[PDB]
TrEMBL record, chains A, B:
Belongs to the Nudix hydrolase family. Keywords: Hydrolase. InterPro entries: Nudix_hydrolase (IPR020476), NUDIX_hydrolase-like_dom_sf (IPR015797), NUDIX_hydrolase_CS (IPR020084), NUDIX_hydrolase_dom (IPR000086). It comes from Aquifex aeolicus (strain VF5). Coiled coil: none annotated. SUPFAM superfamilies: Nudix. It comes from the Bacteria. Residues 8-136 form the Nudix hydrolase domain. This is 8-OXO-dGTPase domain (MutT domain). One of its GO terms (molecular function) is dATP diphosphatase activity. One of its GO terms (biological process) is tetrahydrofolate biosynthetic process.
Amino acid sequence: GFNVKTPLLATDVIIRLWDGENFKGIVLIERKYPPVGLALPGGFVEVGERVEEAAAREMREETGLEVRLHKLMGVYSDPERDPRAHVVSVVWIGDAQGEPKAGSDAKKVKVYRLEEIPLDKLVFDHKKIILDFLKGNY
Amino acid sequence: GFNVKTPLLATDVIIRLWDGENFKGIVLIERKYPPVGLALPGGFVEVGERVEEAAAREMREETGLEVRLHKLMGVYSDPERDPRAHVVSVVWIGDAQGEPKAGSDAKKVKVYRLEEIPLDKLVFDHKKIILDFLKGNY
């Protein structure tokens, strides 16, 4: 077959949650598996699946939300960002209405005001990603 | 050994070539190996390597240019974009000065004015990518 190996591909989303025209903040997850801690919702892209499809799918599974992707925010690939293996993440910014419901790799799902995100409890490199988001560094 | 399979990760660059304040167009590659045709310079991302580093390495290797990445332009993941395997590409827009030159006769370098690119000769989904660039769809 094709004998080429590359980092694993995953996708995460910065979900801006809304209750009508009222901004509530973003949705973060309490990881249920190995890298335990607070983080953005996201998952691995399946072979044969478009990155945007994996993001929507991954959001349904973990947050129960129907997320409309708004913008490609960035691609994070520092070798040591994911303890499980070398994982490169395509990060999106999206929007959603409704009530979050945990599931899958997520043992807990919750909304955080952008001014109330406990940056130091974030796992992976999500603190850097979120800081980039808050600063408009994209 | 982390039994997770995802698409392969690659990165390509749209190189705006300059001769001083004079814009010359884009740097493309004429592939001799399948897919045979015109293509953006780029390659697979290696495990343990950052995407920006893979792009920089591929540019020096394929065009012999010292390219300064300028903008994350997009991520392309259509399942059929690459015939070899499901490959997802992180596309950047960069700039370079100087004269390019192939690192192998299998990859001849050519500079094209944006108005004279033979879109019909582009392989992979690079026609889609180049048009997105020209239309500013990013």
